[PDB]
Structures are given as structure tokens and as C-alpha cells.
């Protein structure tokens, strides 16, 4: 058990699986309380290689989360809180109108891996999944909302699954590692997952995001599916 645990009775946890994943081999407080920016920097350096620059970025949302006014850290169920940054249409949990939207749900995400069609998870597939949960969402949720912000982090949270936790130059990601982080929130070192050697920046995010975006092929845009 030597570098993961499981969350115990009083842990709190984030609707975010690299989150909890990073908690749980305790690059974070592993009761997912009392983050601050330089423990942030430190746990997505240490465990992933993101730079400072988008651990701080990142850092700075998740405090706007926290119910104190200008706070300078944030638990991991400040993240929960419907419509700051955790949004509806989400890959993994369902639309808070249905129920929590903090933990894994296994009917949201057997949607998902169905667009998912290949042992390798590529930027199209990872477009086709998100474009049908947005869509799947406006037509059963009848409370379903995206913010300009909800957009950008759902997005970024594709871009993320690809770039951070895969190959970014590639842009492609095996979908084991990825149904194993969302399935155990835990990293997928036994399936061939490494620690990057390059940094990931937010020029990378950036650019995948991008990538996201140009192969989202609607004839008429339904609602909002590219906003930043
Ligand atoms: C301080 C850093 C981070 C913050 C504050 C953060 C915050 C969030 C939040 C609030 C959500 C929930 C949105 C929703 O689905 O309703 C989320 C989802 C997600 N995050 Fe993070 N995150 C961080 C870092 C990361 C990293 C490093 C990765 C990937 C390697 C990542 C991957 C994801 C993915 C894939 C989702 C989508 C879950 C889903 O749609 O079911 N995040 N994150
Ligand atoms: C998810 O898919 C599996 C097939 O892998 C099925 O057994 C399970 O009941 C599905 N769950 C829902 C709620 O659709
Ligand atoms: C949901 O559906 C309608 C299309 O009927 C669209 O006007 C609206 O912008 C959509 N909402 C979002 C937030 O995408
Ligand atoms: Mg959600």
C-alpha cells in the first residue's frame, strides 16, 4: 500500500480526479485540507511536472471556491460547489440537478468511454466524448447551465486528461490510464505512466485546448461548445 491510501472517514474530496489522485499518494494533505499555492506548486511539480505558472493559475480559481472571502488555501470540497468552477456535463460525475456532482458515477462514464473507440485516446475522440455529454446534458437537465468560465474548464479538463497525464507532442493518451485515474484516482505507474521530463505549461494547456476546439465540426453550433 507503500505511496497510495484510500480517503478515510474525515478526508474531503474534489469532483477533480487528478486531485484526488494526487491527495491520495499524498503529494497533497492527504485529507485534502489547507492546500496553499506553494503546497500546489510543490504536488503538481513533484507528481506531474506542471510549472509554477499554471500550479498558480489553477490555484488562484480553486481559492475563488473557498466560502472565505480572498482566502489564501482551499479543501478539496470547496471545489464541489456547483457553478464557481465545477460545471454540468462533466465526464465522469453527473449534473448536480440529478444528484452530488462530487464523486464518480459509473452511468456518466460509461457515456463517455463510448466515445472513447480505440486503445488510444486521441484529441478527435476526446472532442466526440465531451460534444456529447454538453448535448446529452441541455436535452435531460432542464436546470443545465455552462458558464463562460464552466467552458473553458471543460476544455481545459480534456486538454488536461490528454497532456498531463499522456503525450502532449503526440496529443494522445491510452485509455487505460485514463479509465484507471477516473476508476481509481490513482496513477497509472503499473500501465507505463512516467512522470514527464518537459514540463507542462500553460502554453501547452493552451494549445491543446485549441486542438479541442478545431475538431468540433457542428454545421450549427448548439449552445455554447467553444467559449474561452
Ligand atoms: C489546482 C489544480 C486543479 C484544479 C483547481 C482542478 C479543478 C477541477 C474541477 C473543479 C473540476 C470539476 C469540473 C466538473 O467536471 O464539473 C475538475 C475536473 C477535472 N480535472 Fe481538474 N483541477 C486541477 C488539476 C488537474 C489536473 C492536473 C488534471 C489532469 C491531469 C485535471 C484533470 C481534470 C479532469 C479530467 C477533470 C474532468 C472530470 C470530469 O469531467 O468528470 N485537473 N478539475
Ligand atoms: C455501465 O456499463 C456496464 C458495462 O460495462 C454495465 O454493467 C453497468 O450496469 C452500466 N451502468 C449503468 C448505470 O448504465
Ligand atoms: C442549451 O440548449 C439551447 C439549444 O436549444 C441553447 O440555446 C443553449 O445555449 C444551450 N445552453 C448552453 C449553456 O449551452
Ligand atoms: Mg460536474
Not at 105 to 132: L, Y
Request: charged share 20%; with cysteine.
Amino acid at each position: 500500500s507503500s505511496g497510495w491510501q484510500a480517503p478515510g472517514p474525515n478526508d474531503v474530496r474534489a469532483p477533480c480526479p487528478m486531485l484526488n489522485t494526487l491527495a491520495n499518494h499524498g503529494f497533497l494533505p492527504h485529507d485534502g485540507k489547507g492546500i496553499t499555492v506553494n503546497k500546489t506548486i510543490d504536488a503538481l511539480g513533484s507528481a506531474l511536472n506542471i510549472d509554477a505558472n499554471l500550479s498558480t493559475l489553477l490555484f488562484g480559481f480553486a481559492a475563488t471556491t473557498n466560502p472565505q472571502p480572498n482566502a489564501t488555501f482551499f479543501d478539496l470540497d470547496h471545489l464541489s460547489r456547483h457553478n464557481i468552477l465545477e460545471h454540468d456535463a462533466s465526464l465522469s460525475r453527473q449534473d448536480s440537478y440529478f444528484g452530488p456532482a462530487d464523486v464518480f458515477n459509473e452511468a456518466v462514464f460509461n457515456q463517455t468511454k463510448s466515445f472513447w473507440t480505440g486503445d488510444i485516446i486521441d484529441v478527435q475522440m476526446a472532442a466526440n466524448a465531451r460534444i456529447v455529454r454538453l448535448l446529452t446534458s441541455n436535452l435531460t437537465n432542464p436546470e443545465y447551465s455552462l458558464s463562460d468560465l464552466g467552458s473553458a474548464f471543460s476544455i481545459g479538463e480534456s486538454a488536461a486528461y490528454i497532456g498531463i497525464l499522456g503525450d502532449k507532442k503526440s496529443a494522445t493518451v491510452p485509455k487505460s490510464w485514463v479509465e484507471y485515474l477516473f476508476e481509481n484516482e490513482r496513477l497509472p505507474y503499473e500501465l507505463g505512466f512516467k512522470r514527464p521530463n518537459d514540463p507542462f505549461t500553460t502554453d501547452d494547456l493552451g494549445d491543446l485546448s485549441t486542438q479541442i476546439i478545431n475538431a468540433q465540426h457542428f454545421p450549427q453550433s448548439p449552445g455554447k461548445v467553444e467559449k474561452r
